[PDB]
From Swiss-Prot, chain A:
GO terms for cellular component: 90S preribosome; cytoplasm; cytosol; cytosolic small ribosomal subunit; nucleolus; nucleoplasm; small-subunit processome. GO terms for biological process: maturation of SSU-rRNA from tricistronic rRNA transcript (SSU-rRNA, 5.8S rRNA, LSU-rRNA); ribosomal small subunit biogenesis; translation. This is Small ribosomal subunit protein uS4A. It comes from Saccharomyces cerevisiae (strain ATCC 204508 / S288c). Residues 106-180 form the S4 RNA-binding domain. Belongs to the universal ribosomal protein uS4 family.
Swiss-Prot record, chain B:
The keyword Phosphoprotein applies. GO terms for molecular function: structural constituent of ribosome. Its main location: cytoplasm. Keywords: Cytoplasm, Phosphoprotein, Ribonucleoprotein, Ribosomal protein. This is Small ribosomal subunit protein eS30A. It is found in: Cytoplasm. It comes from the Eukaryota. The modification Phosphoserine is found at S15. Present with 37600 molecules/cell in log phase SD medium.
Swiss-Prot record, chain C:
Belongs to the eukaryotic ribosomal protein eS24 family. Component of the ribosome, a large ribonucleoprotein complex responsible for the synthesis of proteins in the cell. The small ribosomal subunit (SSU) binds messenger RNAs (mRNAs) and translates the encoded message by selecting cognate aminoacyl-transfer RNA (tRNA) molecules. The large subunit (LSU) contains the ribosomal catalytic site termed the peptidyl transferase center (PTC), which catalyzes the formation of peptide bonds, thereby polymerizing the amino acids delivered by tRNAs into a polypeptide chain. This is Small ribosomal subunit protein eS24A. The lineage of its organism: Eukaryota, Fungi, Dikarya, Ascomycota, Saccharomycotina. Residues 37-47, 56-67 have a biased composition (Basic residues). N-terminally acetylated by acetyltransferase NatA. Also partially acetylated by NatC. Residues 34-67 are annotated as: Disordered. There are 2 genes for eS24 in yeast. It comes from Saccharomyces cerevisiae (strain ATCC 204508 / S288c). It is found in: Cytoplasm.
Swiss-Prot record, chain D:
GO terms for molecular function: structural constituent of ribosome. One of its GO terms (biological process) is maturation of SSU-rRNA from tricistronic rRNA transcript (SSU-rRNA, 5.8S rRNA, LSU-rRNA). The keyword Transit peptide does not apply. Keywords: Hydroxylation, Ribonucleoprotein, Ribosomal protein. The lineage of its organism: Eukaryota, Fungi, Dikarya, Ascomycota, Saccharomycotina. Pfam families: Ribosom_S12_S23. One of its GO terms (cellular component) is cytosolic small ribosomal subunit. It comes from Naumovozyma castellii (Yeast). Gene3D superfamilies: Nucleic acid-binding proteins. The keyword Protein transport does not apply. It comes from the Eukaryota. This is Small ribosomal subunit protein uS12A. InterPro entries: NA-bd_OB-fold, Ribosomal_uS12, Ribosomal_uS12_euk/arc.
Length: 185, 60, 67, 144
RNA sequence: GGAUAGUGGCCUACCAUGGUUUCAACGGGUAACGGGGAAUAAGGGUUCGAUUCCGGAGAGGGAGCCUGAGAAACGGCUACCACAUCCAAGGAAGGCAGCAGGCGCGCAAAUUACCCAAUCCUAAUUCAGGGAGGUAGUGACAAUAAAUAACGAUACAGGGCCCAUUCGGGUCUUGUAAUUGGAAUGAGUACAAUGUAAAUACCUUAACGAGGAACAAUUGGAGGGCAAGUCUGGUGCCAGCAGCCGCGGUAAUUCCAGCUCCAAUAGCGUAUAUUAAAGUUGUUGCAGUUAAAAAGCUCGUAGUUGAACUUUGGGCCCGGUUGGCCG
RNA sequence: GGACUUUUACUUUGAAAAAAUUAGAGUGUUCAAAGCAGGCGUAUUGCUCGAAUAUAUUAGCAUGGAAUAAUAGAAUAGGACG
C-alpha cells in the first residue's frame, strides 16, 4: 500500500522490420556519432515524435491562444536552451521541422569530440564512460548527457585522472614502479 | 490416415552427418565497436561493386 | 559531501532531545541490548497463560510431582 | 440511403443491429460463447502439461511423404487425450512412454500446422528439461 | 398498530386490486466485485481493470448473539453442517482470504530473517505496543542509464594529388594487416570513512585489479513475404524443415553441419490472449444483378422518419480586442 | 411582499468538483526512468522561488442564446382583455 513509483519507457520500435534504406541510414547514424544500439536512435526519434506531436497540437489552436502561447514558448525556449533549435528559427514551425541529427549533435558524446579533446567519437565514448571530463567540477559519464549550450564552455578534463592533472594512474604508476625497482634498487 | 508408421529412423540424418568441430577464430568486438566495424565495412572504405553491391558472396 | 547537523545549547539538552541511537553512536549512552524481537514476544505469549503471580503455580505443580 | 437508419434518435436500433452482427464474427463468437473454456484441450491456457501414452508415426499429407513422429498425451488438468508433435531431428528418442511433457500450441489459433494431419500442439519440455536444451545437449534428462 | 435510532409492507391486523413489460419486463449466462484507471497512438473506436487510492463484501459454509458509542465481529462467543487435532476413551481443544512457512492445485508466483530508526495508529499514554509499516533476502515482472574497448608506430597495398620523358612513391590519409608500442578504466577484490536502528549495497576512496588461455555476447535468421550465400561436406520424398507459398526421390539457395553473412542486442525465440493493420462490424465507414447477402407478395402495430408559412427590414446610440499609420 | 405562470430538446458559460494516473510548466536526480525538489550569501547564528496549468463529457445544478426540432392555444366559443 505505497504510492506507485511511476515509470515509462523512452523508445519506440520501427513498424517495418527490414527496410534496407532505414537500416542504412540508421547505421550511418551509429557510426557517425559512435552509438552502440539502434535503440540510441529509436529513443531520440521517440523524443522527436512526442515533440512534433505537441507541436502539431499547439499549431492547430488559434494564434495568441493562451495555451498555445504558454506551452509553445516553453517548448521553444527549452529547445533553444540545449542547442537543438537555432536563434533565427525560434517559432515552433521549425520545431515541427527539425530532425534527429540536430538532437544527436548535442550529446556530451559528440561535444567532447567536437572541440577536439578526443579526435574520435569512440575515443569520446571511452573517455566519458571512464570518469574523465566534466562540466563543473561535476564529473559526468553519460554519453547521452546533451551539452546544455551555456555549459559548452565548461567541457574540460576533470580535476582527477590524467589529462587534467592529479595522477597518472595505476597503469603508469606500475610502470614507474618497474623502473624504480629494476634500474635502481 | 496412417498413424502407426515406422519409428526406427527417428534421428537418422543428424546421427550420420559427420562431426566437424568449429574453428578457433579472431574474437569479434561486442557492442559499439562492432557497429563501428560494420560502418567502416559497409560505407567508409567500401568493397566490391560488381554491378551493384554484395555482402556474403563466395567465389564470383 | 552534504549532510545535516544539530548543535544543542547544552549537553543535557542534547541527551534529552536526541534519538537514543545517536547518543549510542557518539559515546554518550550505552546500547542496552535485549532478547530477540520474537523472543520477547514469545516471552509475552508464555506470560499470557499465567493468571496471578506464578509462584503459586510452581507450588501447585510441586504437588503434581507426587501423584 | 441504403440500409442503416440515419436518423437522430435511432441509436437503439443501431446498437442492437451491431450486437446482432458481431455474432457473425468468428472470434467475437468464440470469446462470448466461452469456447476456450468449453471445448479445446487446453483450458484456454497458453500451455498444458500431460503424460505420454504412446509414440505415433503420423504419415504426412500430400504432396509430402514423411513419417511425423508424434506422441499421444493425456492432460493432467483434463485427462483429455491429445496427439502432439515432437519437433526437430531426433527428439522422439528423448520422450518415452509415461513421461511428463509440456505441450504448447502450434501458433495457428487451433488448426493443425503444416502437413501433420490433425496435430494442434507440440512438445516443449520432457521431464522438466525442455527439448531444445536436450537436442543441442546443453542439458541432460533427469534420473527417472 | 407493533417493531426500529429513526422513514418504509420492515412486520401484523383489516381493506382494496393493484405493480412491471418490445423504450425488452421476468428469466438464463457471466471463466462479473464496482469506480479512479490500463493496453492500443489519424480520428471514431476496440479490449481490459483479481491487483498500491475510494466504495462494497467476506473471514471453511450457514444462522444466532453477547459486549459496546460502534460488530450481526469471527486473530468474540453459541448451535448445526463439512473439515479436523490431543487423550490416560473419562474428555478437551482448532478456523492463515494477517506475516512468513507447508501440502494441494496447477502453465503460473519469493524469507518460517531484522526493526519500531521513518511513515503513521492505539492506550491510562513523550516512554508501552504495532509481521500496520520500514529493512534486508528471493526476484531478467514491467521501467532507467548503458562496459565488453580507446590511441599511436611499422611491413607492404591502395585510392588521392602535382609531374609522367616513363622507374614511381611521398604527403594528406582510406583502411586490410599472423611481429609491435606504451597508454585508460570499472567488472571484481578490498584499509577507511560515509551509509544504517544495526546491518548490506550505492556515492567516495588507500592497496590490488586486461592482452587473446581473456574479465572471451547473446538469441534467431540467410528460397519468398524479409535484411543476409546459389559457398563446402552430409542425407537421398528418408531423416527433417516449413505461421504461409512451399522445400527433401544424388550437382538441396529451405533438412544436418562447417564457413561466411544478416537483424535485434544484455537481451533474443516460442505459446496463449488482445490492440493496431481491419473501410474483414463499417456512427464516422462496408457489402447484398452475376462473388456471402432483398422476405413470393401486399396489409400492418410497436420503432425510426416526416412539405411550406407566424418580427423580417430599416434608423440611432454605448462601450469593448486585436491590426495598422504614426510614439 | 402579494398575485400567477404552456411544456421540452439543442447550445453557451459557470459553479460543485480527491489524490495518484494522463497532458503539461518550473527545477541540471552528473544523464535518464524519476522525485518535488531546490536556489542564494555574511556558507558564526539567513536570505529566498516554489510544490502550477489543462482534461475532468453522461446525469443533476446555475446563467446567456432563441436559429433548428417538437409541444400547448379560439370552432357547439365553456375564448380574450375591463
Ligand atoms: Mg578514481
Ligand atoms: Mg516487543
Ligand atoms: Mg500481563
Ligand atoms: Mg449465420
Ligand atoms: Mg472456420
Ligand atoms: Mg490413438
Ligand atoms: Mg419505522
Ligand atoms: Mg389480483
Ligand atoms: Mg395487470
Ligand atoms: Mg432485447
Ligand atoms: Mg466471480
Ligand atoms: Mg469488469
Ligand atoms: Mg478493481
Ligand atoms: Mg477471479
Ligand atoms: Mg454511500
Ligand atoms: Mg481457506
Ligand atoms: Mg461471524
Ligand atoms: Mg478482524
Ligand atoms: Mg451445506
Ligand atoms: Mg483416566
Ligand atoms: Mg499466509
Ligand atoms: Mg487468521
Ligand atoms: Mg497482522
Ligand atoms: Mg513468474
Ligand atoms: Mg512461499
Ligand atoms: Mg515507529
Ligand atoms: Mg513485516
Ligand atoms: Mg507487512
Ligand atoms: Mg538479488
Ligand atoms: Mg562479458
Ligand atoms: Mg586497473
Ligand atoms: Mg584482455
Ligand atoms: Mg548463430
Ligand atoms: Mg533479400
Ligand atoms: Mg497446399
Ligand atoms: Mg549443399
Ligand atoms: Mg528459409
Ligand atoms: Mg545452412
Ligand atoms: Mg522485438
Ligand atoms: Mg484505420
Ligand atoms: Mg469477416
Ligand atoms: Mg457522426
Ligand atoms: Mg474518414
Ligand atoms: Mg466486405
Ligand atoms: Mg448469390
Ligand atoms: Mg425481391
Ligand atoms: Mg413478417
Ligand atoms: Mg419541417
Ligand atoms: Mg433589426
Ligand atoms: Mg461546462
Amino acid at each position: 500500500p505505497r504510492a506507485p513509483r511511476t515509470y515509462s519507457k523512452t523508445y519506440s520500435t520501427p513498424k517495418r522490420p527490414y527496410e534496407s534504406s532505414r537500416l542504412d541510414a540508421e547505421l550511418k547514424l551509429a557510426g557517425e556519432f559512435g552509438l552502440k544500439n539502434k535503440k540510441e536512435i529509436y529513443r531520440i526519434s521517440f523524443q522527436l515524435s512526442k515533440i512534433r506531436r505537441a507541436a502539431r497540437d499547439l499549431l492547430t489552436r488559434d494564434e495568441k491562444d493562451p495555451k498555445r502561447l504558454f506551452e509553445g514558448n516553453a517548448l521553444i525556449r527549452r529547445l533553444v536552451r540545449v542547442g537543438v533549435l537555432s536563434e533565427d528559427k525560434k517559432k515552433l514551425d521549425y520545431v515541427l521541422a527539425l530532425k534527429v541529427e540536430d538532437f544527436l549533435e548535442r550529446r556530451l558524446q559528440t561535444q567532447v569530440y567536437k572541440l577536439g579533446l578526443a579526435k574520435s567519437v569512440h575515443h569520446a565514448r571511452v573517455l566519458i564512460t571512464q570518469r574523465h571530463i566534466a562540466v563543473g567540477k561535476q564529473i559526468v559519464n553519460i554519453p547521452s548527457f546533451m551539452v546544455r549550450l551555456d555549459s559548452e564552455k565548461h567541457i574540460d578534463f576533470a580535476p582527477t585522472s590524467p589529462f587534467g592533472g592529479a595522477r597518472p594512474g595505476r597503469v603508469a604508476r606500475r610502470n614507474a614502479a618497474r623502473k624504480a625497482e629494476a634500474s635502481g634498487e | 490416415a496412417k498413424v502407426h508408421g515406422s519409428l526406427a529412423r527417428a534421428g537418422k540424418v543428424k546421427s550420420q552427418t559427420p562431426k566437424v568441430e568449429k574453428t578457433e577464430k579472431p574474437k569479434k568486438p561486442k557492442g559499439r565497436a562492432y557497429k563501428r566495424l560494420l560502418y567502416t565495412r559497409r560505407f567508409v572504405n567500401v568493397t566490391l561493386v560488381n554491378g551493384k553491391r554484395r555482402m556474403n558472396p563466395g567465389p564470383s | 559531501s552534504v549532510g545535516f547537523g544539530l548543535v544543542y545549547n547544552s549537553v543535557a539538552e542534547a541527551k534529552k532531545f536526541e534519538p537514543t541511537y545517536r547518543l549510542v553512536r557518539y559515546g554518550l549512552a550505552e546500547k542496552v541490548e535485549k532478547a530477540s524481537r520474537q523472543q520477547r514476544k514469545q516471552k509475552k505469549n508464555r506470560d499470557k497463560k499465567i493468571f496471578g503471580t506464578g509462584k503459586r503455580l510452581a507450588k501447585k505443580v510441586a504437588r503434581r510431582n507426587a501423584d | 440511403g441504403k440500409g442503416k437508419p440515419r436518423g437522430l434518435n435511432s441509436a437503439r436500433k443501431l446498437r442492437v443491429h451491431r450486437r446482432n452482427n458481431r455474432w457473425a464474427e468468428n472470434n467475437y463468437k468464440k470469446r462470448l460463447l466461452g469456447t476456450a473454456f468449453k471445448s479445446s484441450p487446453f483450458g484456454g491456457s497458453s500451455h498444458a502439461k500431460g503424460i505420454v501414452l504412446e509414440k505415433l508415426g503420423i504419415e504426412s499429407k500430400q504432396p509430402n511423404s514423411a513419417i511425423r513422429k508424434c506422441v499421444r498425451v493425456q492432460l493432467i488438468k483434463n485427462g483429455k487425450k491429445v496427439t502432439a508433435f515432437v519437433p526437430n531431428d531426433g527428439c522422439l528418442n528423448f520422450v518415452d512412454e509415461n513421461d511428463e511433457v509440456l505441450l504448447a500450441g502450434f501458433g495457428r489459433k487451433g488448426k493443425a500446422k503444416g502437413d501433420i494431419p490433425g496435430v494442434r500442439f507440440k512438445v516443449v519440455k520432457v521431464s522438466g528439461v525442455s527439448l531444445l536444451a536436450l537436442w543441442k545437449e546443453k542439458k541432460e534428462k533427469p534420473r527417472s
